[PDB]
Write a protein that binds this ligand. Structure first.
Ligand SMILES: NC(=O)c1ccc[n+]([C@@H]2O[C@H](COP(=O)([O-])OP(=O)(O)OC[C@H]3O[C@@H](n4cnc5c(N)ncnc54)[C@H](OP(=O)(O)O)[C@@H]3O)[C@@H](O)[C@H]2O)c1
Ligand SMILES: NC(=O)c1ccc[n+]([C@@H]2O[C@H](COP(=O)([O-])OP(=O)(O)OC[C@H]3O[C@@H](n4cnc5c(N)ncnc54)[C@H](OP(=O)(O)O)[C@@H]3O)[C@@H](O)[C@H]2O)c1
Ligand SMILES: NC(=O)c1ccc[n+]([C@@H]2O[C@H](COP(=O)([O-])OP(=O)(O)OC[C@H]3O[C@@H](n4cnc5c(N)ncnc54)[C@H](OP(=O)(O)O)[C@@H]3O)[C@@H](O)[C@H]2O)c1
Ligand SMILES: NC(=O)c1ccc[n+]([C@@H]2O[C@H](COP(=O)([O-])OP(=O)(O)OC[C@H]3O[C@@H](n4cnc5c(N)ncnc54)[C@H](OP(=O)(O)O)[C@@H]3O)[C@@H](O)[C@H]2O)c1
Ligand SMILES: [Cl-]
Ligand SMILES: [Cl-]
Ligand SMILES: [Cl-]
Ligand SMILES: [Cl-]
Lengths: 272, 272, 270, 272
């Protein structure tokens, strides 16, 4: 358990997919890494090779070589393939290398058991990694150090925001930040459909809907205020906003969103 | 109707309130204007003086002096005060000066009638102007030129996005982009409440809820995809997301949001 | 100007609300009983109610008006117009007039009296225990000092704010009518406790005090109600389970509906 | 089992948190205790030291010292920490010291077992302790005396009202007076939103909502009347109040509150 060199470490991705590509691009963009400090290896699809090579990243010929050449190893394969991937690599997974999993639904207890050591960090990012606005949460294995956590905080900070939490919260996280973007995609479409129903052109309705949601969320993220207070700030007496708000409350809007999170969290738990 | 010099016009705010401050800051930040080209005047509250002076802007002693010194005049008082404010200034409202209203709910027909001429642009911004993410729409009076419009686009482009539309769409705009932020504040709170109901800490639930919404909206704004495509991208077969989405659909989530927009737009119309 | 420390107050309509205001003003020292007058109508039990507080009961409404710097109209609303018309010669501009009548607008008050030195107040039922929510509106000739005087008076029986007359239908639906919404809530909470196995007496005692406490927190804490709700909803706990039931059912929207309906009814009546 | 000296006993808090601070302040305010008769010890957060010292209370260096110096010991740590805290202190928990737990959801049977004796009182307060308007209930362990009960009644009388009940009622007490304040916070916000929907300014709507609720509860507390009679007193024929009440009854308002108490009480039982 030697500290990973914060400014010069090399990063390897096992599973050269979309999430790996997003993280790589983000980290290159933010200057946290350069392409020469990133490695991956393809599986069956040769189009993935091109994706990485075109951003300056070297694609090695096996998972084993990626691990050998890396200080930090990110496992970014589909969850149901992760166990075998880790077991095959296990002789190379020495405690001087920080391991990271972004696999949905795979618990730290299992990660540590497969790898045979506890210098492991789990991250649950979300789809908005692609635009640098992921909501990510990390949980630390028994031997991950504070400096390991800072390294991962800086890396994932390059594709959005990143918070820390106990591993036991990750089913609920999955139902909220993991699954939530679909709730808001529905909301955006519905708001646009509402605009069109009220007489607006469809291109404008959609443009407004998307930017309205973006603006409101940016207020919530930057203002330091409770969402109730933000709502209070915009509801003028007897005005349009409160008329719309009343329709939401008549229908139990808040309880519907709560239901969705809860159902999604419960599903996460059922899928293990 | 002399063209307003694009690179040298002076801007005046009538009503030195929150929205004026947001616009002024934005325009100074973007480099559209320098503080020396902006003027305003205080009403009763001397704290507003400080707000403007601290960004380098000169506070004159009356609304009349602001108008005299300005090529472009933005009316940013509360809507129910606007008529008397304009009537009092009318003699100074010569046709060489471009007039702009940001007042919610006040139609172009009335603006033009109060001012006595048609070189008037209406804008409807929203509350996210404070963080530079407003959704704004402008409509042009009968004598507003294409160059006048470009000037106003550039100015409102500095506090978010800005689109153009006929005045007859403004009730529906008001119900969607004007009132919509409250719908999303409710959504954010409810997502957080859902997280807590599924066992998350509050501080984390709320941070995730806000950043989830922000991220999803960023994906909608940048991806070029229809919201249904985005929803398809994240709903993996039999997974957590589609479980949550199904709960939303069982309850008619989309129709509830449509209802809110339609009701808000109908209220806008009823208020005039 | 009405002498702030020495004025005399008259009640026209010696009912419950007049009694509550009289007691509260006596208790706070804003008035003494010797500075308050009223007159009975038909019920002689009202005489004993006022006399037992040290207040003189005069023999007619006319005498009450003559002897008073400030005149509070505290008869039922449908009786107010005739009462004011009968007294109109005595309603001189040196006397401040006040109505606590539900649903009667300032425009009508001023028209019946023939002048504009008139203040309207909408209190509520909790005046009885010194916890009213009250709002005042000022007629066209009511002065700032007149307003202060009324604030002091209604500050003795609860809280008092100022608002334009045009808000009073909505006020009536919220603070006027709202107590009944809470009485339902209290009963329901108790019934819920009994349904979960609690003894009735204890269920009811807990319900009332839980509501009292929560409202005291909202009043004193300086926090938004959402923040207060956040403070008590621990992760996966009992509180968020209960809140989730409320939200599934659209609890908030139901209370909104009640306020809106009540306000609409106020407008329709008035 | 020596009686605790009613006028001179010393009180110790284990767990120097919010509830401990509320109880301390209430007891000082009412004159039941003086600050010199109260002791506590901090854990990790030194801001808690300042909170108690600023009330005149001595902060000792360990839990063990607090116990040694106290006749009455109040356990005010989070419930999931309580078992270990009591086990560690057990050698000092002699029968001459009255023990009290304010921990939510921890039964008398377990308390007695952990401490190794039955001179134990359980109290369930609620959040309004902060303003002296808690609804609290106590249950008595097998060796708690009448004089012990009077001592606790007096103590908790200083932060609200306090009743006695068998331990088997506590899941339902938790769902009603423990959780109930949230139900009322929703109600207060909803009433305010309703005011705004009916045309009121926000500040006034919220002020009125809060005081209306406070008033009505004071009437219920002081009047000696059944809530149905209080409702009958304010519902004039065909008037505004009955119009509002009818909307409540149409929607099954009473059943919804009953549902919330029941669900909360059931959750309490499930959490143990
Ligand atoms: N995508 C998101 O937005 C998001 C959000 C949160 C979490 N995640 C998590 O991120 C992980 C990756 O998702 P993704 O969307 O990027 O998946 P993906 O695009 O399908 O990428 C997975 C890659 O792994 C490769 N692979 C399969 N077997 C392999 C092996 N034995 N060794 C090395 N590579 C192998 C696949 O290549 P072939 O196709 O050639 O077999 C594929 O390129 C998942 O566990 C997911 O739960 C994703
Ligand atoms: N805020 C938003 O998010 C938003 C969004 C869309 C549209 N709008 C619109 O923008 C306008 C301004 O809103 P706002 O929130 O900025 O309001 P605000 O902050 O209250 O600003 C109003 C300002 O006008 C001043 N004022 C009052 N009477 C005046 C007079 N006769 N002459 C000059 N100034 C006077 C007020 O001063 P005193 O307080 O000192 O009297 C105050 O500084 C409104 O029409 C609103 O509909 C706002
Ligand atoms: N009580 C509240 O909580 C509350 C809340 C808000 C507003 N208000 C308003 O306050 C007003 C009074 O209500 P209240 O509940 O006190 O009514 P109340 O108890 O019935 O008393 C009104 C009194 O007026 C008397 N009266 C009838 N005709 C009269 C006349 N011509 N001259 C003088 N007095 C006459 C009645 O006499 P008899 O005894 O002979 O019948 C009665 O004692 C109402 O307008 C109500 O809307 C009350
Ligand atoms: N708050 C309420 O309204 C309310 C209502 C009813 C019941 N209760 C109950 O009252 C109890 C306390 O709640 P609370 O809100 O007051 O919690 P709190 O504010 O978090 O207080 C807990 C305190 O215990 C300390 N602590 C942790 N481990 C300790 C140990 N081993 N020895 C001594 N102290 C330790 C903590 O210190 P650090 O900060 O350093 O960790 C903290 O100061 C809970 O059991 C709760 O169920 C609370
Ligand atoms: Cl509005
Ligand atoms: Cl999914
Ligand atoms: Cl809880
Ligand atoms: Cl009524």
């Amino acid at each position: 358990i030697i500290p990973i060199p914060a400014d010069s470490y090399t990063l390897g991705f096992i599973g050269a997919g979309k999430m790996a590509e997003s993280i790589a691009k983000g980290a290159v963009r933010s200057g946290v890494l350069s392409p020469s400090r990133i490695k991956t290896a393809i599986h069956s699809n040769p189009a993935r090779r091109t994706a990485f090579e075109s951003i300056g990243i070297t694609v090695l010929s096996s998972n084993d070589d990626v691990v050998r050449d890396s200080n930090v190893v990110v496992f970014s394969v589909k969850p149901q393939l992760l166990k075998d991937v880790v077991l095959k690599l296990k002789p190379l997974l020495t405690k001087d290398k920080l391991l990271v999993s972004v696999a949905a639904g795979i618990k730290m207890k299992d990660l540590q058991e497969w790898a045979g050591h506890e210098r492991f960090i789990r991250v649950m990012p979300n789809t908005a990694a692609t635009v640098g606005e992921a909501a990510s949460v990390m949980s630390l294995g028994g031997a991950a150090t504070e400096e390991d956590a800072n390294l991962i905080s800086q890396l994932f900070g390059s594709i959005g925001k990143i918070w820390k939490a106990d591993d036991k919260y990750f089913d609920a996280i999955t139902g909220l930040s993991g699954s939530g973007p679909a709730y808001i995609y529905l909301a955006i479409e519905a708001l646009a459909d509402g605009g069109v129903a009220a007489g607006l052109p469809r291109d404008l309705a959609l443009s407004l809907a998307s930017q309205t949601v973006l603006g409101a969320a940016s207020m919530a993220t930057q203002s330091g205020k409770h969402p109730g207070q933000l709502k209070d700030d915009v509801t003028s007496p007897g005005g349009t906003t409160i008329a719309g708000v009343h329709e939401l409350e008549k229908a139990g809007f808040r309880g519907i969103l709560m239901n969705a999170v809860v159902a999604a969290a419960k599903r996460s738990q059922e899928l293990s």
